[PDB]
C-alpha cells in the first residue's frame, strides 16, 4: 500500500541489478562479485577467483577501475580518477603482476595519465600523458615517448580535443592498436585557430578569487580544429631513441576544405580502415589503406575509396556507421540507408564498384540498430524489426552463405517481460549473454550459440521483485498514434490504479533531438516513476518527426531546420493525448534537459495555449551558441550563403512574449562546458526585456549533468515542488 | 479611493519635483527650465535666458550634461555617455563659445574622455584620456599632455582605479585645480600587484562568444594599489614641450607599510592640504604643504602634520572629514569626534599643538553632519540636533567671533512639513536655498542670508499634491524604542486607514551597515509605498548598533566584528514591533540589498524563528570576498595575526542549516563588479549542500544596482510576487 516516494528515487532505495561480464576468451569471462573478480566458465557454472577482496584495498578505497591485459598476465589498477568533460578524466595507475603476485614498481606510469590501454594481444601498453603518447612493450620496461608536440589546449596526441570527444568519437581516446600489435595508429588535433569559451569556477568557499576555465570550443560556423593521422611502428622502438611515425593523409575529395576524421578500424595488421567527413556532413569517404613492406609506407588507393552520401540530410545516424571486415578483409558489412531510406546491412568489396558498391542483406520498414558480431559464417545483429516495434530491441542472426537463414534469437524467450535486448557475445561468438532491459524487470541469461540452449540465468531481479511487491508501481503503455497517415509511437507512465474514466494531470517528457527515441520498451525507475506512483501524474513521451530509427524520411524530416516539426509534433501529440479523454486539460506541463529543454522552451513560447507550465534544464537557446560538429550536421553553416535564416528563426528568445501565458522554470549549471549557460543567460535576459516574470535557478559549479550528489537531489526536489505548485497539488 | 499600485512605482506615475540650481556667483544662479538654461537673480525673481532649447539639439538627444566655465564664457557639452562603475564613465565633448555664439571646432577634445573639468577660475580645462592628463589653457588652444605613463588597468593618472573610486573618493576624478589656476595637482595609481576578478558579459544575443571583463580588484587582505601625488605648474606649459611635475611624498608615519590618499584640499595657491590613511584605518595624518618659490618645491613640514586617531574603530564616518580653511589658511575647521565620541566641529591652527590641536566649537549628544560654508565671520553647518532627532536635518549658523551666537535657520520654517533639510549657499553665502526633503512633500525655497527673509518659493509640490489627493497614501511613523537603556530609532510605513487594533504583516527593510541610517524624516515614494498602500503591509526599518550619527559608542559598537550586533538588534527590533500588538506574527519578512542582503541572510540563517521569508539582493556572503578598503576599515586584516577568526565566523554559508526553517529568495546581478556574484554563487552552493530548498534569480548582464529599465521592473515584480506568495496574499 506504499507509493514510490521522491526519496525512493533520490536515495536509490530500490536497486536494479545486472550482469556486466567481461569476455576474456571464447569461453571464459570475468565478473566482479563481492569486490572479487571471478573467472567463470561459460557452459558449466564452473567459477574461480581471479583477483581478491584483497589487492584492491592496497590502493585503499580510491580504486576507480581495473583493466586486465588480454593475455591475462597483468592488471591495470586505476585510482585517483578526476573527471573532465563527458568522457575525459585523468587517473593514477599501477600494474599488478598476476604471475609474480605483486605490484610492478619499476618503470611506473606517470601520476597524471589522460589515457591508457593494452594492445589487443599481449601486455603492450600505450598511454597519453601531457598530451603526448608513450609506449611500454612490457610492464617492467621503460616508456618510449612517441610524440613531443603535445601541448595543453593546443596539440592533442592520442586523445581528442573537446568537440571530437563529444561529437565525433564520444570517447577520450584517439589511439588504435593494430591486431598483433606491430603498429599503433593515432590521431593528432591542432586547436590553434579554434576560439575559446571561458566560465567561472568558484570552488570551496575558502578560495578567495574564482578560477577561470577556458576551453577551445568551436561554436557553429567558427574555425574548427584540424586533424592528422599517424601510424607508428611499435617494434623498432628498442633500436632507436626516436621512431618516425608515418602519416596517412585524408582522401583528395575531403582536403579542399574543413573536414573531420570519422572513424578508425583496423582490418588486419597490414590494412586499416579510415572514415572521413566533410564539414558539411553531406559527403563521407571510407578509405582502406594497405601497408607497403618495401617502401615502408601506407597506401590508400582511390580504388578502395568508397563514398557515402545523403541528399536528404547528413550521413549515418550521428556519423557514418562502422565497417565490419571479413577474416581476410576482402569484404565488409556496414549499416547504410537503402533505396527507401532504411538503415540496413549491406556487403562491400575492398575495391569500390561503380554505383553498386553495396548489396543489401536486409530489407524492410524497420532498421538494423547495430552489427554485434561477424563469424566466418554468421552475422549477429540487433534490430527493431519484431512486432513492428521501433522501440523494441532483439538479437538476430543471418547465415552469410544463405541470407534466407535469418533467425531471431530473443523474440520467443520472454515476450511478456522482454522486448528490449542488449547482447554480448564471447570472443568468437561461441556463447552469448542476453540483457533483457525489456518491459518487465531486467533479466540476464547466457546461452550456447550453437543451439541457443539457455545454459543458465545470470540475474533475474527477484530481489527487487520481492521489494516492489509492497509498493504501488505505475504502469507503462507503449503504443502509437497516427498523424498524416504515419505511425508515431509514444509511451505513458500511468499512476497505479489508473482509472481510464477519471482525469489526471499530464507531464510531457521531452528530448526530441534528431534521431532520438523517448518511447521504447525499456524498464526504468526514475523521477517519472515517482511522479505517477505518488503524485498521480501521467508522464508521457512522444517520438515525432526527426526522430528514432524509423527511416530517413522521418529522421531527416527536420534537416536544415531544427526548432520546427519536432516542436510542433510534440504539441500535436499532447492534443491527441487530451482527446484520449483521461487528461485534465487544465493541468498539462512539459519539461526537458539539453535538447529537451530547448523544445520545452520552444513549446512554452509557442503560445499554443496547450501547456500551463514547463521546466527547461540547461537548454539551448539559439544554435549559434552550440558547437560546430553537432549543430552544422543538422543546420549547415550560419551564413547568408547557407542557412543563416533558419538559425535566426529558431531562437528561444524570439518567443519571449508568448511566455506571459505560462509559468516557466529555467535551470542551468554554472560550469556547463557543453551547453554554455550563456544560453540560459540569454533567455532570461530576453524574458526580462519582455516583462515576463518566471523562475530561475543556477547551480554553482555544476556540470551539464548537474549530477553531483547534493545537486542531483536538490534539482529534482526543486522541480517536484515546481510541478506541485503548478498542478495545484502539494 | 485608488491605492498606490506597483505600476505607479515602476512607471514613476507620481513625479516628485525639486529645484537643482547652480550658483554662478554670489547672487545669480543657473537653472534648467523646459530644456533652457536660465540665469536667475537671487533677490528679485529677475530671470534671463542663458542657453536655449536650441544648442542642445545640435548634438541631438545624446546631450548627457553641460558644464559652464566659471567665467561663464564657455559651455562644455557632454554627450555619448557610457557608464562604467558607480561614478566612472566616458563621454564625448564640445566646447560652445557663448560670446562668439558657436561651437569651437579647432583643437577638439578626444572622443573618449574619461574625465574633464574647468579650473576654478577662467576657462582652463584639464581632462583625462587613455589614463593620461591633458591641459588646454583656453578652449581654442591645443592640448598639452601632462603624463604619459598612463596605461589601462595599470597606471591611472588623474582618475581613480576601482577601489579608490568606490571606497575612498566616491568619484572618478583625481585632479584638483589650485585657486587662480597656477597649479594642477593629481594622484597616480599603480594597480600592478593588485589581483584580478573576471566576470562574463553576454551582450546581445547576436554575440556568439561572451566577453570577459577583468578588473584589478583587491579583496580583503590582498595587495593594494599604490599612490603618488603630483602638482604640476600649469603656467610654464607654453615654454616647454614637457613640464616636470613635482611630487609630494606621504608623511613618514604612513610610509612604513600599505596606505591610502584620504583627501585633497587646496588652501590657497601656495598651500595645499592632503590627508593620508594607514591600511589599518586606525591612524590618519593631514599634512599642510607650502610652495617654496625659491627651490620651486613643495614642503610639508611635520610642524603642520596634524594626527587623527581612533582607539574604538576607524577614522571618520567613512574616512577622515574634510578641512575648511579660513581665508588666509591660518586655521581650519574640521568635524571630529569629541571626548564623548560625538562628531563635532573644532578649530585647528596650521601648526599642530601638543595634545590640544583642537578646540571644539560644538558640544552635545548629537552630531554635526557637515560643514556647509565658512564666511569670514560665520560657519554654516548642518546637524541632527533639533528635537533630539538623529534622523532629522537642519541648517545652523555660528558666528566665529562669538560661539554663543549659534542660530538654527530652518527649525521654525515648517516644523510640520520639514524636518530634513539640504542646503545650498551662493558663492559667498549672500543667499541660500533650502531643500525640504522633510516629512511632507519636498519644498524648495531661497532666502537672503542677512535676515533669512524667504525671498520666494522655488518649488512646492502642489502639482504632486493635487494628484496624491485621489490616492490612498500610507503614513510614516518615525519614533524610537529603548534597549539596554539607549534610544534606538526606527520608522514604519503604515498602510492607509491603519487601524492599530487589527493585525498586519510586517516587512523589515534592512541595510544596517556601519554608519548607516534607514530611519529618518525624509519623504519618499518607493516600493515600500506600494507595499503599504496596496498590499496593506507594514514596512519598517530599524537603525540599531553600529549605525547612524549617534556617536562612536553606537557606531563603533560593531568594530572588528560585522555580522553580529547589527544583525541581532534587527531581530530584537522585530520582537519589539510584535509587542506593539498590530503585527501578525505569523507573517513577518525581511529584505535587503548589498549590505542589506547580507543582514537579511544572516537573520534568516539565525534560526531565531521570528521570520517567515526573506529576500537578499546582491548580498555579501563572507568578508574575504569583498574589497580591501571597505572590509578592512571595520574588520582589519583576514590573518591569524589579526581578525581572521571573526572573518570566518561571520559567514552566511556557515548558517545554511538554519535556512530550512525559512522561504529564501536570492537575487544577484551577473555583471556585478562591486559585490561579485561569487558571493551568492557561494551561498546557493552552501544551501544545496545543506539540502535546503530556496528560490534564486540571476540577472543577465545587470549591474550591482540591477537598474536597467526592464530589469528594474522585473526584479521588483518578482519580489512583489514572492512576498504575496509568502504572505498568503495574491
Ligand atoms: C553594498 N552596499 C556593498 C556591501 C558592502 C559595502 C557596504 C555597505 C554599507 N558595499 C558598498 O557598495 C560600499 N561601496 C558602500 C560605501 C558606502 C555606501 C556603499
Curated annotation (Swiss-Prot), chains A, B:
Stated consequence of mutating residue 595 to L: Reduced activity
Regulation affecting activity: Inhibited by GPC3 and diprotin A.
GO biological process annotation, one example: negative regulation of extracellular matrix disassembly
Phenotype upon changing residue 595 to F: No effect on activity
A Pfam family this chain is assigned to: Peptidase_S9
Designated name of the protein: Dipeptidyl peptidase 4
Gene: Dpp4
Lipid bilayer topology: Single-pass type II membrane protein
Broad class of enzyme this protein falls into: hydrolase
Lineage, broadest ranks: Eukaryota, Metazoa, Chordata, Craniata, Vertebrata
Topological domains, Extracellular: 1-730
